[PDB]
Structure 1
Amino acid sequence: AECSVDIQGNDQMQFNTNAITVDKSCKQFTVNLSHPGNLPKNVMGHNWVLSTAADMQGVVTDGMASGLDKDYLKPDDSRVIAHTKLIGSGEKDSVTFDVSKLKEGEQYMFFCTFPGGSALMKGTLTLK
């Protein structure tokens, strides 16, 4: 509440929300990601990744293609605004980023890059 948000990914490849609002009074924003499932990183990993809506597909494609040993992200990917590490059951990670990286009126998406086979894990992120 206010300048943070706690998000979960499960064994059903779902995030517990598909929408994040960042208040513009915030100097920083923090995402606390957790995994209440039972399965490990290699089979059911989740990360939290931020990019503009235009860049999401590119990030996911090159990320899925980068493999487990890179946490499913293209190394040196400038399109990534912020991200957590890849987590499995019972693990957690948090990322804090400067609200200055976002611009009001601009369209952003948060998403996971783990190749699950099910429908892409994503949601909207808005600066207001």
Structure 2
Amino acid sequence: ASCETTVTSGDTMTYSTRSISVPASCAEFTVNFEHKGHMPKTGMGHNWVLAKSADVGDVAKEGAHAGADNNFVTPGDKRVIAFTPIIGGGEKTSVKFKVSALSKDEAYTYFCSYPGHFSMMRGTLKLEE
């Protein structure tokens, strides 16, 4: 009944885990995200973006053109359920979201939207009954 999890990244294009389970008993869930590499966000930035799996492609396409100042996420993108800002080496961030925003009928994917990272840096998130 833990309603928090920690996902790390580094100077590669992989997350530390590729599956996150959110307990349906949680009212809110927190994802802590840390970058343990030594390269900065200009060249090796990472973020954690959550969307329904069918929407990842379009969110990633539009987000790549939104710019670093918009964390590579289109401003007001209604397909993004929750996201963190981009972080570089030695930085940490987190995001908390309401578990009621998720449905048991849908599939979800978390991924990094820094240009060129989404194909490898992605995982599945599911609501655990």
Length-normalised TM-score, structure 1: 0.94
CA, structure 1 residues 117+8, in 2 after alignment: closer, same or farther (shift >3 Å)? closer
Q: What is the alpha-carbon distance in structure 2 between the residues aligned to residue 118 and residue 4 of structure 1?
A: 23
8 Å Cα contact 2:60-2:118 kept in structure 1: no
String of CA shifts for 1:17-45, please: whole Å, max 9, x gaps: 11000000000000000000010111101
- 1:13, 1:67 → 2: CA distance? 19
The corresponding residue for 1:61 is 61
Measure how far apart 1:118 and its partner are: 8.2
Is contact 2:13–2:117 with CA below 8 Å preserved after alignment? no
- In structure 1, runs of 5+ residues without a counterpart are none
- Kindly report structure 1 stretches of 4+ aligned residues shifted beyond 2 Å: 116-120
8 Å contact kept, 1:3–1:23? yes
Shift of 1:117: 6.0
Give the deviation of 1:65 after TM superposition. Answer: 1.6
Higher normalized strand content (fraction of residues): 2
**Counterpart code for 1:10:** G
Contact 2:15 2:122 (C-alpha < 8 Å) held by counterparts: yes
Over the aligned positions, Cα root-mean-square deviation in angstroms equals: 1.4
Q: Higher mean Cα deviation, 60-69 or 85-94?
A: 60-69
Q: Percent identity?
A: 46
- SS of match in other structure, 1:55: helix
Q: Which runs of 5+ in 2 are unaligned?
A: none
Query: Could you tell me the TM-score, scaled by structure 2's length?
Result: 0.94
Q: Which residue of 1 aligns with 2:50?
A: 50
Which residue in 1 is equivalent to 2:5? 5
Q: What residue is the counterpart of 2:97 in the other structure? A: 97
